C-alpha cells in the first residue's frame, strides 16, 4: 500500500509492515 500524504502517519505505517505484523 501507499499514502498521498506522508503526514497521515498511521496510513503510512500500515504500509511499513510485511506479513510479520
Curated annotation (Swiss-Prot):
Domain of life: Eukaryota
Disulphide bonds in the chain: 1-15, 3-11
Protein name as annotated: Endothelin-1
Organism of this sequence: Homo sapiens
Gene: EDN1
Residues shown, of full length: 53 to 73 of 212
